[PDB]
């Protein structure tokens, strides 16, 4: 997967998905896909890691 | 144990508010006291037109 | 990333779950046990409550 050359080194030092964002959906409440896209793809709101 | 950064930009959500800038409540809490500092200060304070 | 004129101190609060240990001495407290009482509160078309 191609990646910016100024991606942070410490991001790879810990357990993280290669997407650049966390992908946990069990954090959000059950049975709502809109909140799930808000966790996954929405860049209005920050990710659940940093 | 995820490293995080505290920065000026994240710190601006309090730094960009009117309660910093306006002096009226500071002035009110300062002059509503019985005795202020000895009032002797007189120099430039207002310009005097010739 | 230019330093502003003023530094800042940041204050936060944290919660911690603690399992405690409680010690108590003998004859610390006297307890007086009464007699329980019965009352009827809601009579409904389905079921009645006491």
């Amino acid at each position: 997967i191609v990646t910016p050359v100024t991606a942070d080194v410490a991001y790879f030092q810990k357990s993280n998905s290669p997407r650049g964002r966390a992908a946990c959906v069990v954090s959000c409440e059950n049975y709502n896909q809109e909140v799930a896209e808000g966790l996954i793809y929405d860049h209005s709101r920050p990710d659940a890691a940093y | 144990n995820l490293l995080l950064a505290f920065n000026l930009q994240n710190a601006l959500k309090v730094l960009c508010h009117p309660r910093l800038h306006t002096p009226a409540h500071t002035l009110n809490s300062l002059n509503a006291a019985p005795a202020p500092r000895d009032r002797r200060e007189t120099y430039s304070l207002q310009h005097r037109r010739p | 990333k230019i330093h502003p004129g003023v530094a800042m101190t940041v204050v936060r609060t944290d919660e911690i779950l603690s399992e405690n240990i409680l010690f108590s001495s003998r004859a610390s407290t006297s307890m007086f046990i009464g007699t329980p009482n019965v009352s009827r509160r809601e009579a409904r078309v389905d079921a009645v409550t006491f």
Binding site: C24, C28, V35, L39 | K13, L15 | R12, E15
Partner: peptide, 28 residues
């Protein structure tokens, strides 16, 4: 109104999910 709208939009701008836990309010 324009300047206040700009300052509100640039910096000031529920959460969908969180991984770490209950967030802590930071005061400066």
């Amino acid at each position: 109104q324009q300047v206040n709208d700009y300052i509100k939009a640039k910096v000031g701008a529920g959460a969908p999910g969180l991984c770490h836990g209950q967030q802590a309010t930071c005061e400066i």
